[PDB]
């Protein structure tokens, strides 16, 4: 686990180099973004229960065969384990958003998650549908004003969409 600032230092140390002036200014504008990054993380954790339980409700409506007897999410424990995995992935994606780096997300959330779902028999293509339903439920909740000053957050919301896409290809 290393953030976006330590990712630059880890690359410079293997070269034996100081950080040049064009690299410090690329890091001084990450500080300038700053408050806009913490506004995104505040908005996806304050609604973190609503992101999971709405995207789950919209996943068994499109795929009703998951909750039929014989489906992978039919029982009390198999339904609660379905909502559990979505909260874990959403937790680690917000860790990578506050870090600026997807290192913590694939260190300890995505390593072996694909081979876990093959062992259990869980359809990993339907798990990817659930990550994408949590993606746009939190992308749309990032770019609404609602107590924030007006400005451009377009590069940070594109960064947050990249973590949801990385988790959705590392699962199937």
């Amino acid at each position: 686990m290393l953030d976006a600032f330590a990712k630059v230092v880890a690359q410079a140390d293997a070269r034996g180099e100081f950080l040049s002036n064009t690299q410090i200014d690329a890091l001084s504008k990450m500080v300038k973004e700053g408050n806009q990054r913490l506004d995104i993380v505040n908005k996806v954790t304050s609604n973190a229960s609503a992101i999971v339980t709405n995207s789950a409700r919209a996943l068994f409506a499109e795929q009703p065969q998951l909750i039929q007897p014989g489906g992978n999410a039919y029982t009390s424990r198999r339904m609660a384990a379905c909502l559990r995995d979505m909260e874990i992935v959403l937790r680690y994606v917000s860790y990578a958003m506050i870090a600026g780096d997807s290192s913590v997300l694939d260190d300890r959330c995505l390593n072996g998650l694909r081979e876990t779902y093959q062992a259990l028999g869980t359809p990993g293509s339907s798990v990817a549908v659930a990550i994408q339903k949590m993606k746009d439920a939190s992308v749309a909740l990032a770019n609404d004003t609602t107590g924030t000053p007006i400005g451009d957050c377009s590069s940070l919301v594109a960064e947050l969409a990249g973590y949801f896409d990385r988790a959705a290809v590392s699962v199937v």
Partner: peptide, 26 residues
């Protein structure tokens, strides 16, 4: 993808390894 298993992503030890002393990761 990710790092290989066990490797803390970003703390690899083969970043700027010389080629003359490089050892292929099993």
């Amino acid at each position: 993808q990710l790092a290989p298993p066990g490797i803390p992503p970003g703390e690899d030890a083969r970043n700027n390894q010389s080629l003359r002393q490089y050892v292929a990761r099993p």
